[PDB]
Subunit: 415 residues, 3 copies
């Protein structure tokens, strides 16, 4: 089993080795800060090599994805599924933000903050939006350029670019081939750095354990963080998905959980939504009467773009790092977390071995220190096995809803 | 008539509605500055969405245009027409700058300013030229990077790029197809924002009327601005075009105005140089003896790149905004206005629905506040109907001159 | 002879004319600094026009070169030759750095400098790496963005980009055609500016002679600079190449110099490694028993990428300009000079008429004033005739070594 899947085992071996060296090394002496920096330096190299690639990955991924959208994708079954997928993810991210602001683990006006958000959606310059944001200083008011990448402005402009390119049709074939080649190259580059990763994670954990100044104060917030993620998953799935199934289809949603039970158990087992497709197919289209014209489209795209557990997890785990460093997020960074968690949950599953670049996307979208991310990797393998469960349940309810909103059209195509 | 041309009618409806709300709202009370900012905010969003697109439009337009130049374009009839078109536009912009510096509406050394202009033509870095300029501070002297987009350096480098690409021939076909696709995409994007525009113009006019502090001091400079534009058009057309026709062809230029009179009346009527082609063809090649091998090339390119009324208008209306905000332009910004008005007059007619991005090009080429542009849109529909007249007269005199500089070659091709 | 090769003759005519005008003009009076600036201004224009092109030349050259690598290039004869070429160039640059730090012509911690170098190899942002570097300020420590182009980070990222693109195979053909077209365009642009160059070199020499404040103090360091370059060439060639031939092949290396003597004399004569190929072929494969399957690959690529005299010259001549301006290079700029001299020696011969852009690459890689480069052009034509000799001798020893490391494989392909 050690030779199969040689990335998660090296990651947990690096986490355990780094925790052992940090726990043995803080016992010795008050360590000098320069040798602390020399210990934590390969994790800094890892964070820089991953942050180097969030700009061409956004630029290539938006233009490759949004130009491959077919409006003839079985008619209204495409649009209904897309409206479901972009609604439940937003509800999940909003619930995650509320639950991390209310549980609170890890102990200018608001109008100017919201106007700075609206100004940052529409940047004056495109090359300056790659590394600078705008903000409202005050004494009269004035506008000043702070430093940090403007994620929302680039995402907005390249959404407009991909949508305008997809309407050109076959005239813009050369540009989508160019950006497809750029996307394949940057995905191979993301694959190599994640092979380097189990050395950087170990050094980051050792540097975070050595300089913690108290040990039972971080083991309490790392417990309350798992508690708020579990409360978020339980509330989101168990309440909001049968409720959104009841007000639309008006069928009894407990027989629906009686139907998809084996898919949920297998998603808890294999901890991956992509490998759980032949179980949920045999569950849905053999136990719940869903038509094969619905599942064969809804499920293989929901296993790629419908990640509503990852949205709640990444909307909790960014404000948790904001609360550990004492930062208070204003009204303009809460909306940035809630939008970037939605855009990054779709990207965490569509890009292979990119689960660490999505967290760095949010942590540099709101301008946070990214070196506290090593305390999240030490508990991620206790949480992805339950993230996959909420993802699979959100897929199954979507395949149950899109069939009920499309009974009549399938009946007329049948007759 | 309300359903035909649904952009100028919505623009003048937005201008009248914004002027009514501003004139009624400054009557009420001394308004708080924050709700003034909340009123003028959609115009700020419009200015940011238009300034976002002046860099890829320059980059794509230069490379698409300068690589499509045929040196076999009927031999010397191409080169003679291009020398005429790039001379009368420069004379018109220079006359506009002189007439706005002399009439004066809207009440470091010069050597260092000219050397900073020559340094800004040749930038040290290309990514820094997208958002930063250089300037000479003093106490010894030193050179310091000020903020603002470097328009002339990018225009110079991409003129060199397009000229070097056009000489490669058929080897550089992939790159001109890539930039053609980019140009079509950015022109569709410019089309959408100008549909948004009648909401932003109204908010900008309301925010400029509410915070004017005196009403009869802006209605005087908006009168003197129309007076200097009309004096510029009258002087330029009525003196400089028959004079430049007399010293070249040595024919009596008053019979020439007797010939093209219906084209001038129709250009005053339809207010568009592009729709006035079947009138000026029937005028020229049936009344003035111009050969059909001359007009069929000279007029359909002069209705696109020969806009010498728009050059005078945009060279007056930039220094007018500079004089309203109390800025005094040095010797290095006068030449920048005189060159960018020439480059923007060619672009205002070649790019559809781009008449507001050309003004923002000049106002960010010399670094000026662009929020005063709403006082220019409120009088533009009293001035474009006379801009089109000078454009059509400049086309007709060019077709009268290029025929006289090419009588012998057409005679030998005839015999 | 004046009409043949009309670039070196105009360059030495401009150097002599500028030296005459400077030597006659400093005799007159203490010159005002502003007219000194007006004299030295066209050289500043030349330096800006050459520094404008070091970013697209790097970006296009890396992707064009590294994607054209064939691993089937006669099997192991490619890899052996590449390991030789990238080893002797590094040894030559290191010897040049040591010899210019020891002869010394032209009279924060080191750990933080090396960590800033390692941070600068992996930049956080790609658009910020085009014009900004990072450095460690101190009071606690903190990291601060200084200004200047980050050469090593862009070279590292585009090495990764070209290597990942070359493994895609025939899928990434559109992108290598796009970058080939960009490379041809930027090479034509480099050709034009070097035609402008003999006017800028003259103005730079006149501005450097007028403002020198003492004449016999610069003629001593320009003598010691030629002495350390000659000592470097003599030591490198005459000791390190027969030594590296003795420990590998264990043949007597003095008969090897008895073999390639005519190639060395002809390389001293024609002062060009590219035109000396039919002499060194007739030397090697007719006098030293080298197989024709070895020379026909090793020599025509060694006359392009194996320039180990230019590496020593450009590693001496950058630290010489650093020592003339009083700058002391730390441990992080010595490694930057030693790596950029290696990368620029390969580029000085592969790009035609680009011998001045390679020096500006190093002088902006370590952040130095580039206006002192005019004192290097005044002695370059006394030194290139001996640089070419070390280049040709390094080619001949490589063709002598690669044949000895490949005797058995060629014997089995023969039998
Ligand atoms: C990669 C991170 C750091 C930045 C954000 C990248 C996001 C926005 C990119 C990566 C993959 C892209 C998606 C790929 C596939 C699709 C399906 C298509 O029918 C709609 C567009 C959509 C949904 C794309 C939207 C943009 C997208 C989600
Ligand atoms: C668009 C604004 C913001 C920037 C200025 C864009 C200008 C420089 C672009 C837009 C359209 C372009 C023109 C399109 C057509 C031609 C005709 C050709 O025979 C000569 C080049 C020429 C004249 C191009 C020159 C550059 C050009 C005028
Ligand atoms: C002028 C400078 C700034 C451009 C970039 C410098 C270096 C990195 C560039 C310039 C020229 C390039 C080389 C051109 C030719 C070859 C031969 C090929 O078989 C391997 C790649 C190789 C060796 C390239 C490697 C990268 C390269 C050495
Ligand atoms: N949930 C999914 C897919 C899946 O695994 N999604 C996922 C993947 C990687 C991941 O990356 C992080 C982020 C961190 F901040 C961290 F500290 C450690 C890691 Br690892 C986060 C979410 C399903 O199967 O449905
Ligand atoms: N003159 C031409 C073509 C034509 O209309 N040219 C033209 C078009 C738009 C325009 O845009 C502005 C600029 C402003 F500053 C303003 F405040 C309002 C507007 Br609208 C300026 C010039 C012909 O037909 O010959
Ligand atoms: N050595 C080679 C090829 C060759 O000529 N290489 C070479 C070419 C140009 C050159 O450019 C500089 C640099 C300066 F700093 C300077 F001040 C003047 C000049 Br010129 C430097 C090295 C061979 O033939 O083997």
């Amino acid at each position: 089993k050690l030779g199969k899947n040689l990335l998660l085992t090296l990651t947990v071996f690096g986490v355990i080795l780094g925790a052992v060296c940090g726990g043995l090394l803080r016992l010795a002496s008050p360590i000098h800060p320069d040798v602390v920096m020399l210990i934590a330096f390969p994790g800094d190299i890892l964070m820089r090599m991953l942050k180097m690639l969030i700009l061409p990955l956004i630029i290539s991924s938006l233009i490759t994805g949004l130009s491959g959208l077919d409006a003839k994708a079985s008619g209204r079954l495409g649009t209904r599924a897309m409206v479901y997928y972009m609604s439940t993810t937003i509800i999940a991210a909003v619930l995650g933000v509320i639950l991390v602001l209310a549980i609170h683990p890890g102990n200018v006006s608001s109008l100017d903050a919201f106007l700075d958000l609206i100004r940052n959606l529409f940047p004056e310059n495109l090359v300056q939006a790659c590394f600078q944001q705008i903000q409202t200083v005050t004494k009269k008011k004035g506008l000043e350029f702070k430093d940090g990448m403007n994620v929302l402005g680039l995402i907005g402009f390249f959404i407009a670019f991909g949508i305008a390119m997809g309407k050109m049709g076959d005239q813009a074939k050369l540009m989508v081939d160019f950006f497809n080649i750029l996307n394949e190259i940057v995905m191979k580059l993301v694959i190599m750095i994640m092979w380097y990763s189990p050395l950087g994670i170990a050094c980051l954990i050792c540097g975070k354990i050595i300089a913690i100044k108290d040990l039972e104060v971080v083991a309490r917030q790392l417990g309350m963080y798992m508690v708020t993620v579990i409360i978020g998953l339980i509330i989101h799935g168990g309440i909001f998905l049968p409720l959104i199934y009841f007000v639309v289809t008006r069928k009894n949603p407990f027989s629906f959980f009686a139907g998809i039970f084996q898919a949920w158990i297998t998603a808890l087992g294999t901890a991956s939504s992509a490998g759980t497709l032949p179980v949920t197919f045999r569950c849905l289209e053999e136990n719940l009467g869903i038509d094969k014209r619905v599942t064969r489209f809804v499920l293989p795209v929901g296993a790629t773009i419908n990640m509503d557990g990852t949205a709640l997890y990444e909307a909790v785990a960014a404000i948790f790092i904001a609360q550990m460093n004492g930062v208070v997020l204003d009204g303009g960074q809460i909306v940035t977390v809630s939008l970037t968690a939605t855009l990054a949950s779709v990207g965490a599953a569509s890009i292979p071995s990119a689960g660490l670049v999505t967290m760095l996307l949010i942590l540099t979208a709101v301008g946070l220190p990214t070196e506290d991310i090593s305390l999240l990797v030490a508990v991620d393998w206790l949480l992805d096995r339950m993230r996959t469960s909420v993802n699979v349940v959100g897929d199954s309810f979507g395949a149950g809803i899109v069939y009920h909103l499309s009974k009549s059209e399938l009946d007329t195509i049948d007759s």
